[PDB]
Structure 1
Amino acid sequence: ATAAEIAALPRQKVELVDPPFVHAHSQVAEGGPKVVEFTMVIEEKKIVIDDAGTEVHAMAFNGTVPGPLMVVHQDDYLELTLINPETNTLMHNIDFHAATGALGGGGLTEINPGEKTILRFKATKPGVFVYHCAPPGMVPWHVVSGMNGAIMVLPREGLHDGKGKALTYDKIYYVGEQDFYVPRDENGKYKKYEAPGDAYEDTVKVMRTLTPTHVVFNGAVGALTGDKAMTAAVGEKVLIVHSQANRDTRPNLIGGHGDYVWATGKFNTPPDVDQETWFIPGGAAGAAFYTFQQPGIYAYVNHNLIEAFELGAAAHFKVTGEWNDDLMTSVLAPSG
């Protein structure tokens, strides 16, 4: 398509919402290709990542860790207006794994504090993809400071299983997983810093151990539990998009399964089925589809249980509904 043809295309402005929720969208594409517009302001800000009050000088797209999920359809154009406020101190940019060229847009979006840029790319490949800051010379630090998220490019005909059968979810959740490397003092207590730069040297040292001090969902230990636990009901079909821009993860819905899992996150690659624990390599997004059959609490975790329960990679699902004794029943409850 020529510039003229693209300028004639309809344009829709979408308002992003904070993870784990996803902005309103249609699974089946409406009309022909469109230029979907998104705006995100970068905010360098202090966030607390655990109950002890541990701090991280985050670099967050739209002010959240992970950045929000942007949703478009295959062959739509994603036009992102990216803003780096003069209140920030570092240069920032964005790399869309879903895009093609200039390091995912990285080479065309380098913005200093006080600048903005508008990048447009054709979403030619269907699936979920990671996006993240990629400044030449300080990539890992910015990424593990939370500057990453994901987008979903839906097939124009919505989701289907490997054999051509439609898969329509009732709800969708985006679980961004983040590995944090927080310096500790001689007492083994997490250190705090006045400015983000102050922490760089100590942090690089921790990063070199390839051992995160924290592995969390939605920016903090327990962020998706309690009044913020995800929800569903027996019978409900749920799509769980999961991303990790720097380190491997292995999602598992404890008490359930991954009925259809596009482990590689790409829709033209048939999904695996009946999964117990699936695998998403660092630098990628994956997605799992499940129809709940039992009510009660579920633990959604990175299945290296130390990472899940000692480091913070665990969420919960609260599911309402009738218990099914055919699937499972306590013949004899715990007793003498």
Structure 2
Amino acid sequence: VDISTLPRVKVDLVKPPFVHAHDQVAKTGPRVVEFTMTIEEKKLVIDREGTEIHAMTFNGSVPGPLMVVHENDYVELRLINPDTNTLLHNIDFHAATGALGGGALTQVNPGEETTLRFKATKPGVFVYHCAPEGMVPWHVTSGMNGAIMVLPRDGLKDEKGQPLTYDKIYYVGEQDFYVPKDEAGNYKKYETPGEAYEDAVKAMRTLTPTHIVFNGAVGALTGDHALTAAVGERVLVVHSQANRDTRPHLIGGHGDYVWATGKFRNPPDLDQETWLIPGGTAGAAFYTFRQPGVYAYVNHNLIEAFELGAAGHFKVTGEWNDDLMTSVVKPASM
């Protein structure tokens, strides 16, 4: 095919956990979908104590934005590494085929840009991440990862082949950080990236994260930034973890339909309490809310959730169903 004969559509990305505009069922034939991301190395405060790290980001956020296309669209990404950064970066799409997912073709030094195109031949949610030869886990675990959703052209389907249509979508990126510690257990204070590298490596080799967070920081998806829904709304939560296994769980709900390893030509698993998303994968869970109130959404290693950061909230509006749950006798002495 002469790709130049296809429609081009430019996407304007949004910051997670929100997701840019798309149509579930494709309203056109295959397109070249044009994306731009600018790499930003920046300081980020990741916990309540004020711990500040040097993060490596796509588009300024941890995770990077969710990109959305349909099966057999072409993804055309312009990747910009401004001269205000100091490191070499690239990008690997798990949705793509060839050249280390794109990484072998997208190495950009500070002051460089590149444009990669690939055909999105398989439907699903997929991780993308930076992967510079010889320093791959350092970039990934500094926050340099996101996800892309490749929808089937006729949208999502249940285990029987009937449509599933979400009303809302959110993207939860989960990040394991390995902040170097001294022997007493305090995070080291690096009076450059090179000077940090060996103890970053040492810290990673412990295999023990210091922080495991959603949307880049402890508490990021809480308070004025809680996720929201109404009773009766159908919500898709895309969840990625580029480096380490996670086990999502909606406290007070379920995953009604879950693609735990994220690939839509497979039937979803029904009625999940908790699912395993392996490190290096994106998964997706669909739920119809049935009760109002606060929900937590967690990695159900509850130490990881409530001590290390892997917990967010939904605030859900609407009527309470006492058939479905009620306090028959409220807590009392007697």
Relative to the length of structure 2, the TM-score reads 0.98
Corresponding residue of 1:327: 324
Q: 2:273 aligns with which of 276, 282, 299?
A: 276
Corresponding residue of 2:10: 13
Corresponding residue of 1:92: 89
Aligned partner letter, 1:192: K
Asked whether 1:316 is paired with 2:313, we answer yes
Partner of 1:45: helix, strand, or coil?
A: strand
Question: 1:191, CA displacement in angstroms?
Answer: 2.3
Asked whether 1:156 is paired with 2:156, we answer no
Q: 2:210 aligns with which of 205, 208, 213?
A: 213
Mapping of residues 221-240 of structure 1, within 5 Å? 221-240=218-237
Corresponding residue of 1:145: 142
Q: 2:253 aligns with which of 229, 253, 256?
A: 256
Aligned partner letter, 2:230: A
Q: 1:299 aligns with which of 284, 289, 296?
A: 296
Mapping of residues 50-89 of structure 1, within 5 Å? 50-89=47-86
Mapped to 1, the partners of 2:186 and 2:115 lie a distance apart of 42
* Preserved CA contact (<8 Å) 2:16 2:64: yes
Equivalent residue pairs, number: 333
Partner of 2:164: helix, strand, or coil?
A: coil
Give CA-to-partner distance per residue, 1:57-115, whole Å, 9 cap, x none.
11100111100000000000000000011111111100000000001011110111111
Question: 1:197, CA displacement in angstroms?
Answer: 2.7
Corresponding residue of 1:184: 181
Corresponding residue of 1:134: 131
Poorly superposed stretches of 4+, deviation over 6 Å: none
Mapped to 2, the partners of 1:22 and 1:192 lie a distance apart of 36
Partner of 1:294: helix, strand, or coil?
A: coil
Aligned partner letter, 2:185: G
Question: 1:262, CA displacement in angstroms?
Answer: 0.3
Corresponding residue of 1:29: 26
Mapped to 2, the partners of 1:264 and 1:289 lie a distance apart of 14
Unaligned runs of 5+ in 1: none
Mapped to 2, the partners of 1:222 and 1:121 lie a distance apart of 36
1:194 and 1:165, CA in 2 relative to 1: closer, same or farther beyond 3 A? farther
Question: 1:184, CA displacement in angstroms?
Answer: 2.0
Mapping of residues 33-52 of structure 1, within 5 Å? 33-52=30-49
Give CA-to-partner distance per residue, 1:181-211, whole Å, 9 cap, x none.
0012344222232623322211211111100
Mapped to 2, the partners of 1:54 and 1:294 lie a distance apart of 37
Partner of 1:285: helix, strand, or coil?
A: strand
Partner of 1:27: helix, strand, or coil?
A: coil
Mapped to 2, the partners of 1:134 and 1:194 lie a distance apart of 28
* Preserved CA contact (<8 Å) 2:181 2:203: no
Partner of 1:277: helix, strand, or coil?
A: coil
Mapped to 1, the partners of 2:316 and 2:17 lie a distance apart of 17
Unaligned runs of 5+ in 2: none
Question: 1:51, CA displacement in angstroms?
Answer: 1.3
Mapped to 1, the partners of 2:119 and 2:24 lie a distance apart of 18
Mapped to 2, the partners of 1:208 and 1:327 lie a distance apart of 47
Aligned partner letter, 2:121: T
Mapped to 2, the partners of 1:194 and 1:52 lie a distance apart of 20
Aligned partner letter, 2:211: H
1:100 and 1:196, CA in 2 relative to 1: closer, same or farther beyond 3 A? same
* Preserved CA contact (<8 Å) 2:230 2:316: yes
* Preserved CA contact (<8 Å) 1:298 1:318: yes
* Preserved CA contact (<8 Å) 1:55 1:192: no
Partner of 2:156: helix, strand, or coil?
A: coil
Mapped to 2, the partners of 1:152 and 1:53 lie a distance apart of 33
Which is further off, 202-211 or 143-152?
202-211
Mapped to 1, the partners of 2:242 and 2:283 lie a distance apart of 11
Identity over aligned residues, as a percent?
82
Asked whether 1:110 is paired with 2:103, we answer no
Partner of 1:317: helix, strand, or coil?
A: strand
Relative to the length of structure 1, the TM-score reads 0.98
